[PDB]
Amino acid sequence: MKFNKEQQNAFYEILHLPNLNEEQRNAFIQSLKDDPSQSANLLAEAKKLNEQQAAFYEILSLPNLNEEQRNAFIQSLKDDPSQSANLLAEAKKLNEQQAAFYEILHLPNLNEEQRNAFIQSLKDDPSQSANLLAEAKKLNEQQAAFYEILHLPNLNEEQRNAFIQSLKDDPSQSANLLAEAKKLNDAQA
C-alpha cells in the first residue's frame, strides 16, 4: 500500500514543518509509514503541534514583556499547550498595552500633566490602549510642531508668529503648517 498524492503531500508537508524537533518529526514519519491512511489527521496534529510551538517562540519575541510575565506565559503553555492560541492573544494583548505605557511615558512634547492624564487613564482601562496611544501621539506631534516652528533658524518673527498663531487656532492643521514652515525655512537658507 504505497502513498497516494494526498498521503505523499501529507508526508512532504510534515517533513517541512519548521518548529518540530527530530523526535516529533521521526515519530510522525514512522506512524505515517505504518498506517498511511491516518495521513490527514497526522498532518493536522503535526500542524497543530507545529503552531503551539510557534506560539512559544512568539512569546519569546515580544519586546515589552518582562521575564516574569513571559515565563508565566511559557509555563502555562507547557502545562496545557491546547490553549496556546488564547495564551498567545493575551501575550500580545498585554504586550501592546505595556507598549502603550512605555511610549506614552516617553513622549518628548507632552507636559507632565497631559502625560499623567494619559497614564492614569491607561491604568483605569487598559483596553483603550490603542485609542489612547494615538491620542497621545497626535497630541505630541501637534505640540511638537510649535517648538519646531520656534526653532527653525532661518525664519523671522512674523513668519514664526503667523505659523504659531495659526497652529494655536487650528492644531489639526499642524501637518500642513509644519510642512509650510519647513519648506519656507529651506527657502531662506
Numbering used by the authors: 33 to 221
Quote the passages of the study that discuss this structure, keeping the authors' original sentences:
To design amino acid sequences that can stabilize the alpha helical structure of the fusion sites, we superimposed one or two turns of terminal alpha helices of connecting proteins using a molecular graphics program. Then, the amino acid residues important for forming a fused helical structure were chosen from the two natural sequences in the superimposed region. Our method does not require complicated computer calculations for the design process and can be used for the assembly of artificial protein complexes with predictable and rigid structures.
We thought that proteins with alpha helices at both their N- and C-termini might be fused to generate artificial repeat proteins by connecting the C-terminal helix of the repeating unit to the N-terminal helix of the next repeating unit. All these repeat proteins were successfully produced in E. coli and could be crystallized. In the crystal structures, all the repeating units were connected as designed.
